[PDB]
Design a protein around this ligand. Structure first.
Ligand SMILES: CC(=O)N[C@H]1[C@H]([C@H](O)[C@H](O)CO)O[C@](O)(C(=O)O)C[C@@H]1O
Ligand SMILES: CC(=O)N[C@H]1[C@H]([C@H](O)[C@H](O)CO)O[C@](O)(C(=O)O)C[C@@H]1O
Length: 283
């Protein structure tokens, strides 16, 4: 699969290649090390690419603007405030067959991240050993692919993404445990995005393009309007934004931020407001 590829804006557990059950963990306001996977936001890392440098910032999800930082000239690594220092940039490059990634420092490309015997971390020169190979696993894919889910608007604790009765239109509605409010999330490799299938009629969350821009359940299609990028809110791993693949500046949006049963769900320009923020949970 290509679901765990090093796409920009995506969020990952970063593991040693020798153990998928240990992951990179912001332990203190400064210290990082490999740790048993428990999935708090301290163990989730967002990639922020820099096309000019062809390198990435690796940013922890729990703290505003702390990014993985080489403490030059020392051999240690920490998380520190983002100041766009060259020592805070990393080439991430993948072996296609093993899936292993080398995490190489931008400031000094002789040096690469390595995991020590006691699972602490450091930068060091590259030697063949497996102590410099990491696996990246996309958090959302690993949590949500092939799962039956419900989607709650952040506007209100009991208003959910719902196919309307005897219509194709999708609206907000309070929970009544209906198959109309149940959505199976499936990744598609050709689109590098997800479809969401209503359990009631086995049809898909789709942007219907006209003056109203309603989302509706629609038959299976290869058109981009049926595909969604599911990502965490910019600085919050409890909340999600869903971009439509037809136009990745547009997102799943509650019309006029109304909360009333039956309020239309639409596709609208991104602003990051509460009406474009969703809580996704397994049923
Ligand atoms: C999301 C959804 O399907 N809502 C439907 C509700 C619920 O089925 C009902 O509240 C169950 O308690 O019923 C209606 O109001 C109705 O019967 O006229 C139509 C509406 O589309
Ligand atoms: C608002 C936002 O994120 N826009 C970005 C989208 C989304 O990240 C994507 O729809 C969700 O994965 O990705 C890009 O198209 C990309 O990564 O090349 C860049 C674009 O600026």
């Amino acid at each position: 699969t290509n679901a765990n590829d090093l796409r920009n804006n995506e969020v990952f557990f970063i593991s040693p290649s020798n153990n998928t059950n240990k992951v990179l963990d912001k332990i203190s306001q400064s210290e990082v090390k490999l740790w048993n996977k428990l999935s708090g936001a301290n163990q989730k890392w967002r990639l922020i690419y820099d096309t000019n440098k062809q390198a990435y910032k690796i940013k922890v999800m729990d703290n505003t603007s702390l990014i993985l930082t080489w403490n030059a000239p020392l051999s240690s690594v920490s998380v520190k405030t983002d100041t766009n220092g060259d020592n805070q940039y990393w080439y991430l490059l993948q072996n296609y067959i093993s899936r292993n990634v080398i995490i190489r420092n931008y400031m000094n490309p002789n040096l690469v991240l390595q995991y020590n015997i006691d699972d602490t971390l450091m930068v060091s020169t590259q030697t063949s050993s497996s102590n410099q190979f990491f696996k990246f696993s996309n958090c959302i894919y690993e949590a949500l692919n092939n799962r039956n889910c419900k989607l709650q608007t952040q506007l209100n604790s009991d208003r959910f993404l719902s196919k309307n009765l005897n219509s194709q239109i999708i609206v907000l509605w309070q929970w009544f445990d209906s198959s109309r409010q149940k959505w199976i999330i499936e990744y598609n490799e050709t689109k590098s995005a997800y479809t969401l299938k209503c359990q009631e009629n086995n049809r898909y969350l789709t942007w219907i393009q006209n003056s109203n821009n309603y989302v509706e359940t629609y038959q299976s299609t290869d058109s981009l309007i049926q595909y969604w990028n599911i990502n965490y809110l910019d600085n919050d791993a409890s909340k999600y934004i869903l971009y439509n693949l037809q136009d990745t500046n547009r997102v799943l949006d509650v019309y006029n931020s109304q909360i009333a049963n039956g309020t239309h769900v639409i596709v609208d320009s991104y602003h990051g407001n509460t009406n474009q923020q969703w809580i996704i949970n397994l049923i």
